[PDB]
Design a binder for this molecule. Structure first.
Ligand code: HEM
Length: 399
């Protein structure tokens, strides 16, 4: 028999919003941990339950150091200084604190008018041209790209270049392709730094150049890695939430109608979509630097551990009928953004963008529908951020 106690991980979605069959099996199997086999044949642990996931994300013995030989790499792509997503305290905090000013609740509130303007501008163009359109290239991707560009001080004129490079890095299936894409972005950002040294400019990259870099408090290549992380996360991840949210909501028309009828439900719907779609398991990897006993299971020093937030988010002890989309439920404490010192820097920018986008789509494109069957969509594999790379849509064309 072929039966194993260490199934291949990750699994690929066959429905944009449903747990892969293999993940349902992991979810249903008692205990916080399960053994899996990664692409290169190495065994690692996955964390599959909600409280255990929080506990392990909060445990400093589970390091975020991606340079470690034993870090649980899920694809050949995983093969330069790390941005703070790959650092542990105390280094993590010194670098993260260089960027937090741009993501405060006050700044996010100040960004609302800008986000609304950007969203409506891309809708103007799309709706003027008429259906059909690919929602990804025409809306889902450009909106957060334009927003993160202004936040960073990266000129939006270079969007085609950096969007292509970002996709190649995030979705590469080989190390060579990933490395070329990273090199492309690094060289670009290094040029921007030099330009800011000549002519001080706006945006987070400008601020880091004028202050921390000028004071020797961040290495030039660390600034490059940090800007790269924010550029990629700031547009690729939110774009995927948009497209997958549209697909999901169109497959749940009663809930979508209820949402349209009472816009005060939108923040809660955003939480539920984040919980339900949980697009970022690829950011759950950890390596143990010491032995950790977990409800009788032993993680040994040097073992890889992946905190699979998508499965933790379907823990029925926390979310009653966990596989049911319910925009009125308490989706409080979901792990779609992680938990603890590394909890997503951009989480509230993501929440703002999704709220503005859903309200705009309901206002201006109430007749929006998919232009192809859901089954015909091509879903990204579990080795990258979840999503679709194309989303054909149509609507009632008003002249
Ligand atoms: C719905 C969209 C998003 C999702 C689901 C998401 C998910 C996540 C997750 C799960 C983590 C934790 C990684 C870990 O524990 O190792 C994380 C961290 C991070 N995210 Fe996001 N993210 C999103 C959007 C964004 C945006 C818009 C930005 C823009 C700056 C961003 C920037 C970051 C950064 C810088 C970190 C590292 C934080 C740290 O290490 O202290 N993310 N994200």
């Amino acid at each position: 028999p072929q039966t194993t106690d260490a199934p291949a991980f990750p699994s690929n979605r066959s429905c944009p919003y449903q747990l892969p069959d293999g993940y349902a099996q992991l979810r249903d199997t008692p205990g916080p941990l399960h053994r899996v086999t990664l692409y290169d044949g190495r065994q690692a642990w996955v964390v599959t339950k909600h409280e255990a996931a929080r506990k392990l994300l909060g445990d400093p013995r589970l390091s975020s150091n991606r340079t470690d030989d034993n870090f649980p790499a899920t694809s050949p792509r995983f093969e330069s200084p790390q941005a703070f997503i790959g650092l542990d305290p105390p280094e993590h905090g010194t670098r993260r604190r260089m960027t937090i000013s741009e993501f405060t609740v006050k700044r996010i509130k100040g960004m609302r008018p800008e986000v609304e303007e950007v969203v409506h501008g891309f809708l103007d163009e799309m709706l003027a041209a008429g259906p059909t359109a690919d929602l990804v290239s025409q809306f889902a991707l450009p909106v957060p790209s334009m927003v993160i560009c202004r936040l960073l001080g990266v000129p939006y004129a270079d969007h085609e270049f950096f969007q292509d490079a970002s996709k190649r890095l995030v979705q590469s299936t080989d190390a060579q392709s990933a490395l070329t894409a990273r090199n492309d972005l690094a060289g670009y950002l290094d040029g921007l730094i030099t330009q800011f040294q000549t002519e001080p400019g706006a945006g987070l990259v400008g601020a880091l150049v004028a202050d921390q870099l000028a004071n020797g408090e961040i290495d030039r290549e660390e600034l490059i890695s940090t800007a790269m992380l924010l550029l990629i996360a700031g547009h690729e991840t939110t774009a995927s939430m948009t497209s997958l949210s549209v697909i999901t909501l169109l497959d749940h028309p009663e809930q979508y109608a209820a949402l349209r009828a009472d816009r005060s439900l939108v923040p809660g719907a955003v939480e539920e979509l984040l919980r339900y779609l949980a697009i970022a398991d690829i950011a759950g990897g950890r390596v143990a630097t010491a032995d950790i006993e977990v409800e009788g299971q032993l993680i040994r020093a040097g073992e890889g551990v992946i905190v699979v937030n998508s499965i933790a988010n379907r823990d029925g002890t926390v979310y009653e009928d966990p596989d049911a989309l319910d925009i009125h439920r308490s989706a409080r404490h979901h792990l779609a953004f992680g938990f603890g010192v590394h909890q997503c820097l951009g989480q509230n920018l993501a929440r703002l963008e999704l709220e503005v986008i859903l309200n705009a789509l309901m206002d201006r494109v109430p007749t929006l529908r998919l232009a192809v069957p859901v089954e015909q969509l091509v879903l990204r594999p579990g080795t990258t951020i979840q999503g679709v790379n194309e989303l054909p849509v149509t609507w009632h064309h008003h002249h």
